[PDB]
Amino acid sequence: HPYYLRSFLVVLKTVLENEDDMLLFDEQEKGIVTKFYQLSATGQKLYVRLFQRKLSWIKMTKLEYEEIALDLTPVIEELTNAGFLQTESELQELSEVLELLSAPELKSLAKTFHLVNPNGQKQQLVDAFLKLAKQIGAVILKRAKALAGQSVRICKGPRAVFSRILLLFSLTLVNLGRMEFPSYTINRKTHIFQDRDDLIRYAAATHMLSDISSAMANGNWEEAKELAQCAKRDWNRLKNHPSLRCHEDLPLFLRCFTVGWIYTRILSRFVEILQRLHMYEEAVRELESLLSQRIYCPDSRGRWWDRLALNLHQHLKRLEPTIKCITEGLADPEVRTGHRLSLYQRAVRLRESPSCKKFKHLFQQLPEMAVQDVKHVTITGSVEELALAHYRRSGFDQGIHGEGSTFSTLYGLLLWDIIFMDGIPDVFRNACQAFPLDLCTDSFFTSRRPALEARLQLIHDAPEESLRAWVAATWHEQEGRVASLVSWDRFTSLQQAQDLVSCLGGPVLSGVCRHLAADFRHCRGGLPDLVVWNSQSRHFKLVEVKGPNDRLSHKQMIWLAELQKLGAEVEVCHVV
DNA sequence: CCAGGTCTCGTCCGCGCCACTCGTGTCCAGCG
DNA sequence: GACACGAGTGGCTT
DNA sequence: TGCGGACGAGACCTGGA
């Protein structure tokens, strides 16, 4: 079987094997799945290939895939009987015929009925024939279909079922069959989706969010704004619908996969575009409304407070609301790492600024958390490779451009037993899960608290050999197994990881792992990019490399201060 | 004492799967 | 009529 | 969300006065 068919079959079997997931699908949808199974291998390959393509008609001349078959003409018939593909006979909607027609063939069609400018843009000509059809339409359609040829569209019905299956799988695509996943007991005690309609709703919400992200990428913002507006209108409805209340009681990691969560991320994208369209007052209204709920996306409350403060300060030029927003944001426990530092820095800059005296300062009430200053080194001399070269010139001999993946890899290696341990409900729902589902959530440290603290303390008091024994044992058992935390390409060899942990030492590594385990989402970003060590000296310098243009991020400063606190010498290498 | 150039911090913005084949918009030199 | 560039979408991606 | 590029606004001095 080819790669795409293997991946699709893996997804299909994964969704089949979970009984709760198939509780969602109706009888005819399971019939469609079985119909897919009772097809030729060539037919399955063809349908997967068309599934990767967009839901538009494809000219039969363009469709040919030599590997699936020398000739696709029968396979098309086979899929046609089952209801998977609709051949030319169903092409009764004229707009898609025009889109199917090639532009030179558009010119030919305009010649056939030259009631309109012969030449021009494809969109313009298509609008022209569409107007012409409205004002003879049967003959126009007949000639259009005749000149187009034979085309096959992936039927909406079956494609919807396979799309929901893919959504369920990726919820928890080229190398899917080849990559093997780690060993862990599959245990789901709650249902991410309660009813089939709920998955339909989740599919609709994710489709809307994907449309808004496509508008993000294309740079089109007005359509993005109206899409976000209708999304907000939709989420204004269905709020009273009992489905949401059941979804609230869900754990945070499982609540991530809910209609409300996707609509809240859509609202966040609306905040981003509103700032992009410079409708800053509306962005402030949305951000204040976003923080009015504690239920959905508590993880992103930091960006909401930071953006609210920045909007009220430098883009609405109001100080009194800014003081309140900074104080409230620092008061919310959910803010971590960079955003807390950003709000603090805003508060301190306002404190030692003119025109802030007018009101009671309220920063006397505000806590004073100060990032420890880190040593800054500037070398003159691909900037990160240059920094590696400069440190190689120093006493240090080796180093790895971790970019935060090195600490994630070490943490995953040294805590793999706890990361994938059993006895935790719903944190592994499918046989295909690269990472435990409760990771990137505060529930990770709480649920695993005894063993997590035990292993973290052990690493804290671990001799270098014990860390090396643990890293060696875990790597041998799990090399290759998929894991979001562990990047196997990140370390050249297991000996490299052994040398790294031993050089880093048990305490500072234990602290880094503790921070990554308490809240991985906020602590993962901002780690120093470059870690350098000398094998003989066993001395390490963790270096965050920032070019002349870019300055230290708030997360980077927080992590550098924390790493210096743990006993690591950290400097920021500027290469000018 | 006043500058006008410079700095530096704060902020916005584009992308956030990649080169790759192929249908397209336009114009551009001739063409009548 | 060609047209020759770029751009863009779409497809494929072990 | 994390980058790496941009912009500009207030400081700010010092050359010149």
Author numbering: 372 to 506, 519 to 555, 576 to 784, 813 to 1007
What do the study's own words say?
FAN1 (FANCD2-FANCI-associated nuclease 1) is a DNA structure-dependent nuclease ubiquitously expressed in the central nervous system and peripheral tissues that plays a role in resolving interstrand crosslinks at replication forks. It possesses both 5′ flap endonuclease and 5′-3′ exonuclease activities, allowing it to process DNA structures that arise during replication stress and repair pathways. FAN1 comprises a DNA-binding SAF-A/B, Acinus and PIAS (SAP) domain, a tetratricopeptide repeat (TPR) domain that mediates dimerization and protein-protein interactions, a virus-type replication-repair nuclease module (VRR) containing the catalytic site, and an unstructured N-terminal region. PCNA is a homotrimeric ring-shaped DNA clamp that encircles double-stranded DNA after being loaded by replication factor C (RFC).
